[PDB]
From a paper:
Crystals were obtained of [name] residues 723–805 and 753–805 complexed with both [name] and [name]. The crystals obtained with Sac3723–805 had a pseudotranslation in which one half of the asymmetric unit was shifted by close to half the unit cell, which makes structure solution more difficult because this effect greatly reduces the intensity of half of the reflections and so reduces the amount of data available. The model based on the 2.5 Å resolution P21 native data was refined to an R factor of 18.8% (Rfree 23.5%) with excellent geometry and contained [name] residues 9–161, [name] residues 753–805 and [name] residues 6–95. This structure was then used to solve the Sac3723–805 crystals using molecular replacement and generated a 2.7 Å resolution model that refined to an R factor of 21.0% (Rfree 26.4%) with excellent geometry. The somewhat higher values for the R factor and Rfree for this structure were a consequence of the pseudotranslation (see Chook et al., 1998). Figures 2A and 2B and Movie S1 illustrate the structure of this complex in which [name] was present as a long, gently undulating α helix to which were bound one [name] and two [name] chains. The [name] region comprises [name] residues 723–805 and forms a gently undulating, continuous 12.5 nm α helix, which is encircled by two [name] chains and one [name] chain. The two [name] binding sites on Sac3CID were designated Sus1A (residues 726–751) and Sus1B (residues 760–788). Although there were extensive interfaces between [name] and its three partners, there was negligible interaction between Sus1A and Sus1B or between Sus1B and [name]. The Sus1A chain appeared to have a slightly less intimate interaction with [name] than the Sus1B chain.
Residue numbers in the entry:
A (entry chain D): 6 to 91
B (entry chain A): 15 to 159
C (entry chain B): 722 to 804
D (entry chain C): 7 to 93
C-alpha cells in the first residue's frame, strides 16, 4: 500500500507527533497567529450575530489555515523529514 | 422674621417630615416634597438654584436654617383667600360645593378630634344661614375670615 | 526521492493542530459573548427594578407631602371654625 | 463587584436622568403615576404611619404589574443599550 500511515504510526508511537504539534502550537502562539484568529473570529461575529456557531466556524477555518506563515510550515516539514530518515 | 407661632410649626414639621435620616439636611428630592408640604411647588431648576445659593458646604444639601428663611418668605407672601378655598375643597371631598355633616365628621375623625354627632350639628348651625343644614363656600369663607 | 509522503504528513499535522485551535478559539469568543449577554440581561433587569423602586419612593414622598399640607389646612381652619 | 463601576458611570454620564425621565413621562402619560399616587395615599389614610417598607410591600406587587408592556419594553431596551456600549 501507500503506507504513509506506518510512518504516522511510528511518529505517534515515539512521542514525536505530539512534541512536533506542541512546538507548532508554540510558534503559532509566539508569532501572534492565535491573536490573528481570535480577531478574525470577532469580525465574522460583528458582521452578523444571527449566523450561528457552525457557520462562523466554517468561514474561519480555511482562512486561519492560510494565515500560517510558510517558515512555520517549513519547520514542521524539517522535523518530519528528520524522523523519517531514521 | 414675622411669622405666627403656628406658621413656624408648619415649617418645622415639614422639614422634619423629610429629614429622613435626621442628618439635619435635605437633598433635592426631599426639599422638593418638603416645599410641597407647605403648598409650594417649584421647577427643578428653581429649587436647585436655591440649594447652590445657600450651599455653604458644597454638599448639594440645604440645612434647616436656610429652609426656614426661604420658606418663611414665601409663606409671608401667601394669599389668605386661596388658602381658605383650598381648605373648602378639602372639607367637601364629595365635590358638592356644600359641606355636609358626614363631611364634618369625616374631617373630625381625620384630625383625631373627638366630637359628638351633635357638636358637629351645632358647628354647622353656627354659620350656615340659610339653607340647608350645610355650609356652602361663601358661608365657609365668612367663618375663616 | 519518494518523500512527497513527508509533505503529505506535514500537511495533515498542520491541518489538525489548526482546526483544533480555531475550534476552541471560536468556542471561546462565542462563550465569552454569551457571557456578556448573561451579565447584561441581569443588570438590565436589576437597574430597571431600581428605576421602578425609586419612582415608587418619589410617589411615596409626594403622597406624604400632599396629606401633610391638607391635614395642616383642615386642622387650622377646623379648629378656628370650632372657636 | 464591578457592578458599582457601572452604577456610577450610569449617573456620572447623565444616563440615569435620561431613563428615569423617559420612565416618568411614560408612566405619567398612561396614567400609571396617578393610580399609584391614589392607592398609596389611600393606604396612608390608615396613616400613623406606616413606614415605607410596610407601604411598599402592600402596593409594590400590584404596581410593578400595571406598567404598560409598551413602557416596560422601551425602558428595558434603553437600559440594555446603555450597558452594551460599556461591555
Amino acid at each position: 500500500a501507500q503506507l504513509k500511515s506506518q510512518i504516522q504510526q511510528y511518529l505517534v508511537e515515539s512521542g514525536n507527533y505530539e512534541l512536533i504539534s506542541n512546538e507548532l502550537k508554540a510558534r503559532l502562539l509566539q508569532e501572534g497567529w492565535v491573536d490573528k484568529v481570535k480577531d478574525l473570529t470577532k469580525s465574522e461575529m460583528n458582521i452578523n450575530e444571527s449566523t450561528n456557531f457552525t457557520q462562523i466556524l466554517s468561514t474561519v477555518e480555511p482562512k486561519a489555515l492560510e494565515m500560517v506563515s510558510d517558515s512555520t510550515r517549513e519547520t514542521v516539514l524539517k522535523q518530519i523529514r528528520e524522523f523519517l530518515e531514521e | 422674621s414675622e411669622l405666627l407661632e403656628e406658621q413656624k410649626q408648619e415649617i418645622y414639621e415639614a422639614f422634619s417630615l423629610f429629614d429622613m435620616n435626621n442628618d439635619g439636611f435635605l437633598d433635592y428630592h426631599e426639599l422638593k416634597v418638603a416645599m410641597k408640604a407647605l403648598g409650594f411647588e417649584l421647577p427643578k431648576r428653581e429649587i436647585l438654584d436655591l440649594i447652590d445659593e445657600y450651599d455653604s458646604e458644597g454638599r448639594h444639601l440645604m440645612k434647616y436654617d436656610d429652609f426656614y428663611i426661604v420658606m418663611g418668605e414665601k409663606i409671608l407672601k401667601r394669599d389668605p383667600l386661596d388658602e381658605i378655598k383650598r381648605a373648602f375643597q378639602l372639607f367637601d371631598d364629595d365635590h358638592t360645593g356644600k359641606i355636609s355633616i358626614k363631611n364634618l365628621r369625616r374631617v373630625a375623625k381625620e384630625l383625631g378630634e373627638t366630637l359628638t354627632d351633635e357638636e358637629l350639628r351645632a358647628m354647622i348651625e353656627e354659620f350656615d344661614l340659610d339653607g340647608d343644614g350645610e355650609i356652602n363656600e361663601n358661608e365657609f369663607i365668612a367663618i375663616c375670615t | 526521492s519518494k518523500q512527497v509522503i513527508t509533505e503529505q504528513i506535514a500537511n495533515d499535522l498542520v491541518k489538525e493542530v489548526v482546526n483544533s485551535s480555531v475550534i476552541s478559539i471560536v468556542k471561546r469568543e462565542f462563550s465569552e459573548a454569551n457571557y456578556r449577554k448573561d451579565f447584561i440581561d441581569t443588570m438590565t433587569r436589576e437597574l430597571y427594578d431600581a428605576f421602578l423602586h425609586e419612582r415608587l419612593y418619589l410617589i411615596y414622598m409626594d403622597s406624604r407631602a400632599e396629606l401633610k399640607r391638607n391635614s395642616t389646612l383642615k386642622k387650622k381652619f377646623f379648629e378656628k371654625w370650632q372657636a
